Amino acid sequence: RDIPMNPMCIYRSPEKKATNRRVWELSKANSRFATTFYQHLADSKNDNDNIFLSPLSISTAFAMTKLGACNDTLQQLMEVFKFDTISEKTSDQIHFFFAKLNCRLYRKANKSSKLVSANRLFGDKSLTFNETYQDISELVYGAKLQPLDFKENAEQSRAAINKWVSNKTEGRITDVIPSEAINELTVLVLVNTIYFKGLWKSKFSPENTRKELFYKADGESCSASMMYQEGKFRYRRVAEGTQVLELPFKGDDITMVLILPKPEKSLAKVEKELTPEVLQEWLDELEEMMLVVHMPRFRIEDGFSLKEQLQDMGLVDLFSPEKSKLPGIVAEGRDDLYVSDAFHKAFLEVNEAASTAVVIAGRSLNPNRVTFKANRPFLVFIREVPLNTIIFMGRVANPCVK
Amino acid sequence: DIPMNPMCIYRSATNRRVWELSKANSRFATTFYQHLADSKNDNDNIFLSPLSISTAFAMTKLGACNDTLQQLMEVFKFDTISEKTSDQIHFFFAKLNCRLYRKANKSSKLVSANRLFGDKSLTFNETYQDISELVYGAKLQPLDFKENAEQSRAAINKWVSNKTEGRITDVIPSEAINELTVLVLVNTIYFKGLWKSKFSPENTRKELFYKADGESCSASMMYQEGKFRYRRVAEGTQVLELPFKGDDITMVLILPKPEKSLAKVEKELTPEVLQEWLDELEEMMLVVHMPRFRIEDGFSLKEQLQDMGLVDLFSPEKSKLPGIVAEGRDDLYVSDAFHKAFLEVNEEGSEAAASTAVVIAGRSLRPFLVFIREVPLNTIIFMGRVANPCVK
Numbered sequence A: 001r002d003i004p005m006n007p008m009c010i011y012r013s014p015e016k017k018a019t020n021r022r023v024w025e026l027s028k029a030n031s032r033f034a035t036t037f038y039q040h041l042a043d044s045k046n047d048n049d050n051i052f053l054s055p056l057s058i059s060t061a062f063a064m065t066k067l068g069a070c071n072d073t074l075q076q077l078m079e080v081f082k083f084d085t086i087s088e089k090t091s092d093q094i095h096f097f098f099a100k101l102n103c104r105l106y107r108k109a110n111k112s113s114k115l116v117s118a119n120r121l122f123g124d125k126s127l128t129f130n131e132t133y134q135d136i137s138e139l140v141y142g143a144k145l146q147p148l149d150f151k152e153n154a155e156q157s158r159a160a161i162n163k164w165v166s167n168k169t170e171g172r173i174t175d176v177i178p179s180e181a182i183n184e185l186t187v188l189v190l191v192n193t194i195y196f197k198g199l200w201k202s203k204f205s206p207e208n209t210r211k212e213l214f215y216k217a218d219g220e221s222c223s224a225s226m227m228y229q230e231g232k233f234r235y236r237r238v239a240e241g242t243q244v245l246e247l248p249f250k251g252d253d254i255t256m257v258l259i260l261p262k263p264e265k266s267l268a269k270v271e272k273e274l275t276p277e278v279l280q281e282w283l284d285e286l287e288e289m290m291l292v293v294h295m296p297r298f299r300i301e302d303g304f305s306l307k308e309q310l311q312d313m314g315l316v317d318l319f320s321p322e323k324s325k326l327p328g329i330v331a332e333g334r335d336d337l338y339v340s341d342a343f344h345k346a347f348l349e350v351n352e353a354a355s356t357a358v359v360i361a362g363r364s365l366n367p368n369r370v371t372f373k374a375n376r377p378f379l380v381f382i383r384e385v386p387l388n389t390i391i392f393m394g395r396v397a398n399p400c401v402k
Numbered sequence B: 001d002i003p004m005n006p007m008c009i010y011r012s013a014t015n016r017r018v019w020e021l022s023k024a025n026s027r028f029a030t031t032f033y034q035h036l037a038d039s040k041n042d043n044d045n046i047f048l049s050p051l052s053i054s055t056a057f058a059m060t061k062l063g064a065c066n067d068t069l070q071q072l073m074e075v076f077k078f079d080t081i082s083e084k085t086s087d088q089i090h091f092f093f094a095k096l097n098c099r100l101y102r103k104a105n106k107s108s109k110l111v112s113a114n115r116l117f118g119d120k121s122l123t124f125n126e127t128y129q130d131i132s133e134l135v136y137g138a139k140l141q142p143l144d145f146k147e148n149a150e151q152s153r154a155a156i157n158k159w160v161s162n163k164t165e166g167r168i169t170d171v172i173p174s175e176a177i178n179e180l181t182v183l184v185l186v187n188t189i190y191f192k193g194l195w196k197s198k199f200s201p202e203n204t205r206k207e208l209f210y211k212a213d214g215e216s217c218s219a220s221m222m223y224q225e226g227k228f229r230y231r232r233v234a235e236g237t238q239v240l241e242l243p244f245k246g247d248d249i250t251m252v253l254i255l256p257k258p259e260k261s262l263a264k265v266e267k268e269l270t271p272e273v274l275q276e277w278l279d280e281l282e283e284m285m286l287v288v289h290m291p292r293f294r295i296e297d298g299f300s301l302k303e304q305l306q307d308m309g310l311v312d313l314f315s316p317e318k319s320k321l322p323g324i325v326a327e328g329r330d331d332l333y334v335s336d337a338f339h340k341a342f343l344e345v346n347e348e349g350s351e352a353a354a355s356t357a358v359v360i361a362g363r364s365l366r367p368f369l370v371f372i373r374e375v376p377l378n379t380i381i382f383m384g385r386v387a388n389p390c391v392k
Helices: A022-044 A055-068 A071-080 A091-103 A131-141 A154-168 A267-272 A276-284 A306-313 B018-039 B052-061 B066-075 B089-100 B126-135 B149-163 B262-266 B273-279 B302-308
Strands: A051-053 A115-124 A188-196 A226-238 A242-246 A257-260 A287-296 A298-305 A341-350 A357-360 A378-384 A389-396 B046-048 B109-119 B139-143 B183-194 B221-232 B238-243 B249-255 B282-291 B293-300 B334-345 B349-360 B368-374 B379-386
Touching (some): A022 A051, A022 A306, A051 A055, A055 A115, A055 A389, A071 A091, A091 A131, A154 A188, A267 A378, A298 A389, A341 A389, A357 B221, A357 B249, B018 B046, B018 B262, B018 B302, B052 B334, B183 B379, B238 B273, B262 B368, B302 B334
Antiparallel strands (some): A226 A242, A298 A341, A378 A389, B046 B379, B109 B183, B221 B282, B238 B249, B368 B379
């Protein structure tokens, strides 16, 4: 029930910008940020470059920091991470919706398809956070303030941070924070990622995993480990013949959508054409169908300093020591409390634990079934169906790496 | 050895008889199978029990002579066991059937029954009657073939029935029996085993079996994941073994790589290969999609068996069968011989039934391989080719 209290900061969202539910409105926004945040990163990159990140992590972390911002800083956050798209809702409210979305998204239960949230903001031992910033982050986001001795044992903290992401990401993401990133002037830094585990609902067979070639953006030749399989999946052929396909995970609430353009016909043009609408409209039109599926095995890693993107985008004040309005952290007072940096790392390795061979007796399909050869650059999304929240996003343009 | 097995005895690590025999059976099974395959089309069904057959004719042999008794020891591969005589086979076959149906205690239900339907008015050798009612537990039952043939065929068919817990009915066709009929030997086997690791209903979906060279059809596939003995042999041929609860009875599957003609594999079958496959199998962690289906097959053994070698036996002017009806050879030949089998695979387990019947004097006339095997004895009980899981 509505408990996260707030003072005199609360910004008013404009009265403007399929049931009526907080989590749905929230997810609708989160998706709009994500799709755009991606359209930018993308446009900045090389066409032959893999891209992988968790928008739901970013969008989540910043909305927590925001629990302690005010005046111009607060507006800016809410304006960048689209939370104001939720017509009429006051800023404080946003956190309640978050709680609600967070409740039914993370836990130690059910069909082992895991989701562990690593979102934490480290500040120097010379920072006493507002007693409420505290209670509410812990409650609504399940996080801490975590005082680190940034000035003295500067490197020790840096490490200590990284030595913490690893233990939560079961050792996979480690050096979330890079080299010259932390020094004596690291008042406070924000780290976050999401680790996820899950097994295919219809695993591929290693025995059929061949060695066909991938057709890059410019290079037209690459040897990838292509996985073979035919079975029933939600699929569809959309505008300009773009193929959309969904491969559910055992933990049903989570799936993996991919989008393949006709005869290459540039992932780029298809990348530029996006919107949560073009997207949902796509997702709506998928019906079960029996077909052949090809997919390379792939592992992609990406880490970064959000700063550069988030400012170009509109989130400046949070970073300016001169403009950052951070009342939530009265370590001392106005005392230029701003945000040093905020890090994110994303990891997805894709397989066929692998040895589980596969046998099928007495299946004899239509000689005329649609196929799906992902031997070209494609998009990747990892959605959470009942919640309708885009958790990761990606582009696989080089599935060889050798 | 004590069994006073008599008349017509013909005569042609490294020794254990019962095995030599099981193995002998097996070499017959594959070959008989191969001919059956041939009169049949590669994408049609085939289910049978080359164990019942070996038996029904093993007990017929009892009363055959000269050229008959010979051809039978040869085609049913009896002259492969060594350093023994024609009358000894039944001693072994007797102990095989002894060690076979007594196994697993109260897990796997494997059971057999044999019986003779002889005419009421005739007198049969008292030895025959005993040696049969002894080595193979077959008690003879007096039927009126001359006055009312039909009702006898009925009563006969209905024998097979309570024996096969309801699955085998029309073993004997409507026009098989007649007034001239002397005897009718019969075997029936039954088995109902539970899967050591059952499939669950919740997980079973209805795939589409678009029939090759034809129309659309509706399949019902089960699925489960677990540890099993498997191996992917030469040419892509997958070979999986499914342990039944009665740990010694176990179904074996053989599927060719992504449909590259089964006939090709059927044509290279021998108990050697089939032994090798089973030999080099290895316990894998894997996923299975077995169709839940039911199939019934039936046919006359006559034709194939002739091509195989049993000619004399089905000939009016030469089948040497003196010891049956005691007095003489009369017109003792086999006008025909029939078989009918039944398979039912499902979440819980598998169910097969079979019954062979030989008539003495009367009138004349895709996917994969399945295999129910008895491990210790190495006896292929039932066997077949599945090519239509939907069947409604």
